[PDB]
Structures are given as C-alpha cells and as structure tokens.
Amino acid sequence: FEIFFKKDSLWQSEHLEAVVDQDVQRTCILHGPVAAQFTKVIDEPIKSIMDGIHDGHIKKLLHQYYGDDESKIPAVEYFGGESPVDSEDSAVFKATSSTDEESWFKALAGSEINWRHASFLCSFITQDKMFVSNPIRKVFKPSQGMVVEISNGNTSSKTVVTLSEPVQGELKPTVILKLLKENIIQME
C-alpha cells in the first residue's frame, strides 16, 4: 500500500488536467518553510527575480565598500574563466623542447585582459552552440624551431602576433593572429 500511495507524487502539481476535479488540494507541492516567507508575487519574470537579488547586492556592496561611487569599480574587458586556484610592446619568444606549455601561453596572452588574453588561455571556443577545444592553442603549442613575434603588444586594437617556423631550410611566417574590424579575431 505504502508504495502505491507514494510512488510518483510530484508531477501532479504541474498538470491538474490529469488529477480528479483539477483540485490542487489533492496534490504534493514541494516548498521550504523559511523560503516561503518571500514567495508573495505570482508570475514575476525569472529575470526580474534573479536581477532583483543581484542588483540588491550591488546597491548595498557599493554603499559599504565603494562609498556610493560606480567610478571606483575596476573595469575589465570580460569577466570570467578564472580557476579558483591561482608590460613590453615588441617581444620575441623561441620555443625549445623544454618550454613548459602553461608558461609559454602566459607569455603570449600577456598581462592585460583583452582578445589576446582570451585567444591563448580560453581552453574552449564555441562553433554555433557546441564547445570545441581552442584551435589557437593547438596551433601555437610549442616545439623546436617555432618563433613567435608580437608587435604593438601594449595597445590591443593593433596588436599582431606572428608565428614563424622552418620552411625548406629558411624561417618564414606561418600564422598571423590579429584583430580585423573591432570584434573579429582573424587567424590568417
């Protein structure tokens, strides 16, 4: 009896059409005692709710720790992808058989958070909706002979990073990773 009675008790509240008399009072609705004392307004858009709580935290955090002044908030290009564990304008790097991968990509990325920083430390990128491994780190994965040259390193908008390798003896340019028009990274 206990199984028959209790078996599959949680869909009914979403589908009253399929309950005798379309009667809520028959039904199991899951809800917290304490949290119930804030659930007052029916059919509030989820964005309105979740923003409410977030914009509430800012309004306050701003008051305590930034003397009610948005101008004191550190600006960054893009917020995200920081594992919770951890300036030169015209440089030249030279991969060996020793060069550690993590060190090598810190260097190319540089200090500032911009398109170059993403390009070399973003582990993933998006084709349409899917998440493919970052091809720009595949290409620049270091090995004996490959020679990176950065130019305008300290002004993102014109920075150019230019990989060169051995090609039929001599050393020629094989990749040219840069900005086109403002929001497009070309990897020629």
């Binding site: 009253l16 199991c28 304490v34 709580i53 509430g56």
Partner: protein
Amino acid sequence: GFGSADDTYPYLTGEWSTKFDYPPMPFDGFLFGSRVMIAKEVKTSPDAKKCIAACTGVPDDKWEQTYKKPTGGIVTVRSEMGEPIHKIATRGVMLWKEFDETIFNLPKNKLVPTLEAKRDYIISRLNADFQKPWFATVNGQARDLATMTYEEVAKRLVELMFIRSTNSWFDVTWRTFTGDFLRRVEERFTKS
C-alpha cells in the same frame, strides 16, 4: 531559506557568523529553489502558485515545527524511504501525514490487519483528498476490484487516464495499459 538581497547579504559579507561570536566567514554564492517556484515561466499550475503565494511561512527560529504540524502552511512527510520532504500542507499531504503516524510506522505483522480494519476509512479519504484515488469506485460507490465488471474497469481506466479537455491520453504507456486490458477481455470472453 533565501528570497532577497537583504537576508542573503549577511552571508556575502561574512557578518552572519559575527552573531555567533565567530570571526567573519563569507560565502562565494547562493542558491534559490523555493523562491523561484512562482516565476512567470515555470510549469507549476496556476492554482498551485496561488497555493504557494498563500503559505505565509515562518522565520529560521521556528521552521522545525514542520515535523509536528502545519507551520507557515507547510509540513514534513516521510518518502517511501523515510527521508523527510517539505510539502505545502494541502488536504492530500495532511492525509499522507496521517498515514505516516498511523499505518506506515506499524511493523509488517500489524500492517495488513490494520488495513482490513480501517479499509472503509482509508477509501473515503483516498477518494475525498488524495491525488491517487481508490481505483474501484463506480458512481461514487466504493467497491473492490473483484466486485467490478470488465466494463466498469475499462470505463474507469478511461476516466482516470484520458483527459477530456485536451482529448488525449496523459501518457502513451497508460493507453498501452488500457489497450492490454481490452485485449484480455477478448481473450477471456471469446470461444474461438
């Protein structure tokens, strides 16, 4: 037990743990389940949202009252496993709570004897209150499955499993259940 910035800000800042004579102890973010059950674009049926909005609730000092009696419009009832669940105290759930205190807490050797004794009570209450009604009622009259005709069964499977408003079977597996039963009727009553 979170709903706004105001109750959740002391946990962001670390100052919640000051109240208990500890040093500040701040948290890296929050989760809101219960809060978000009445949002515009969940599937919770309108009448259920009204039922949620009606639950007054209770502060953290008092929430453990739920193990005894409806507290802010909310009780705890045991699952089939004995895990607590926090549910709004609808008629349904109050019946569930009654049967936890009376029938399901009995040892196995007292269980079947008690069901025979309380049978007509249990059926009145399933039909009146609970989301799963007693199967074998025809025209509001509580039978048993052995005192129902093959027709009375077919007609009642359709009543409980087929939705007249949408004109469809709630779940295809339910349609296969009734279809299998009609195929039994043919097997049982055909000569050839």
